Design a protein around this ligand. Structure first.
Ligand code: ZN
Ligand code: ZN
Lengths: 241, 241
C-alpha cells in the first residue's frame, strides 16, 4: 500500500447538533408523527436508501446513523437517509408500531398472511414467544405504505437497513456491497436469512429485484456505536457501490 | 431473614407486546407527535411520576421502562409513566429536540438564560463542546410547556427521571428513595449534581420543592438493560416511597 487513503473531512464536532439538510416528509405515522427522509445531495446513477428504525427499540443504529449524517458535509451525501421509519415505536420503546404490528412482518409480500407471529423477548431468552401482529389484510400500516411510495418515487438502486442485535451483515445475493459492509463494521456475513419470511422487508425487496442488505449490529449501546462505528456509517453515506 | 419476599407476579411474557393501559395525551411535540403518559391505576397519597426520554438518544432507559410497564399487571401501577417526553428527538436520534434545544437546559428556572451551552459528543470525548440551544426567552419548548402543565395538573409527590450514560443515581437531598434506587439498580449515589444548572429539570424541581431523582444508567444496550434491570424498573413502578 503506498499511502493511507485520506481521512474523510467532517463537519467540526462543535457544529454537529444541527442538521444542515432539511428533511422532507414522506408520510405520517399511526400516531400522527411526520415520517422524514433526508434527500441525497449528489446526483448519481447509484443513489440508494439507508434506513433505520424498522423496529422501534433498535436505537443504537438510529443514533449512529444520525450522528454520521450530521458529521458529513451536506454536499457529500450520495443516498437518501431515513433515521427512523417507525417514530411511534421509538417514543413507545417497542419493537412493533402503535398498532402492535411488527413492521418487518407487515410488507405486502406474495406470501403475506394475516396470522400473527412471535418475536424474542431479549437476546438470551431461549425461544421467540412474544406475540405480535403482522397487519390488516385490507390496509397497510401507514409507515409501510409510506416507505413503499417513497421507494416507488425515488427508485433507489439498493437499500441498506440497520437492525440490532444479531451481530451480522445479512447478504441477499453474495454481493460486494455486503462484503464491503462486513469489513467496515467488522461483522461476519451470513447469506440468506429471513429473505423468505412473509412480510419481511428483505422478502419484499427480493420480489422486486431490489438489492437489500441488513446490517444487524451486536447488542451495543448508542455511545459505543458512536465511538466504534461512526466512520463506518459516514463511509456508507458517501459510498459508491 | 426468614423467607425470600415473594417474586412479583407479571403479565405472561407471551402477552407483553400490548399496553393494557391506554395512555392519555398531555400535548404535542414540535413536529406534531403526541406526548403520552400512562396514568397511575392505584389511588394513593404517594403517587409520583416516572419519566424517560428527556434526551432523545438515551433510549436504553426508554426500552427498560417500556418493557417494565408492559410486564406489570395494570392494576399494580402506582405512578404516572412517561416513556418518552421528547418523541421527536427519539426519531431524529438526537440529544436535543427538533429545534436543537437541550430540554434539560430549557426549563424556566430562576437563573435560566438565553445563551447556548455545549454537551459531550460521546462518553470518552475529553470535553463538552457540541453546541446546543437552551430555548427562546419568549416561549417554552412545547415538550417543556406540556410536561410542566402535566405536573401542575397531577401533582406528583416525586419524579424519577432516567438518563444515560453517567452510571449513578443523582440524589437531590440525601433521601431514602435515592438509596433504594441505588440498591435496586446497583449504582453509586452522588449528591447534588446539576441541580443548580440554568434550565435543568432538577433545578426546576428544587425551586418547587419537588423531590426529583435522576437515575443515569451506564452506557448499556437496551438488550442488557432488559436482561439486567427489568425487575428494578418493575419494582419502581409499584414502589411506595
Ligand atoms: Zn430488528
Ligand atoms: Zn441525559
Amino acid at each position: 500500500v503506498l499511502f493511507q487513503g485520506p481521512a474523510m473531512s467532517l463537519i467540526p464536532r462543535t457544529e454537529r447538533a444541527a442538521f444542515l439538510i432539511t428533511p422532507t416528509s414522506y408520510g405520517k405515522s399511526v400516531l400522527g408523527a411526520p415520517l422524514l427522509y433526508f434527500p441525497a445531495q449528489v446526483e448519481s446513477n447509484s443513489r440508494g436508501l439507508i434506513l433505520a428504525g424498522t423496529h422501534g427499540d433498535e436505537t443504537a443504529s438510529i443514533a449512529g446513523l444520525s450522528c454520521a449524517l450530521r458529521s458529513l458535509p451536506a454536499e457529500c451525501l450520495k443516498h437518501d437517509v431515513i433515521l427512523s421509519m417507525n417514530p411511534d415505536a421509538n417514543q413507545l420503546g417497542t419493537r412493533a408500531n402503535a398498532n402492535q404490528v411488527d413492521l418487518n412482518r407487515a410488507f405486502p409480500t406474495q406470501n403475506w398472511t394475516e396470522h400473527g407471529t412471535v418475536y424474542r423477548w431479549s437476546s438470551h431468552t431461549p425461544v421467540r414467544d412474544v406475540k405480535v401482529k403482522t397487519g390488516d389484510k385490507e390496509q397497510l400500516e401507514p409507515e409501510v405504505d409510506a416507505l413503499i411510495s417513497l421507494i416507488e418515487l425515488r427508485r433507489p438502486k439498493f437499500v441498506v437497513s440497520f437492525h440490532e442485535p444479531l451481530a451480522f451483515v445479512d447478504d441477499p445475493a453474495h454481493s460486494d456491497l455486503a462484503k464491503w459492509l462486513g469489513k467496515q463494521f467488522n461483522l461476519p456475513i451470513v447469506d440468506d436469512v429471513d429473505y423468505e419470511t412473509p412480510g419481511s422487508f428483505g422478502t419484499w425487496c427480493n420480489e422486486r429485484q431490489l438489492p437489500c442488505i441488513t446490517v444487524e449490529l451486536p447488542p451495543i449501546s448508542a455511545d459505543l456505536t458512536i465511538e466504534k462505528h461512526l466512520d463506518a456509517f459516514i463511509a456508507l453515506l458517501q459510498h459508491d457501490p
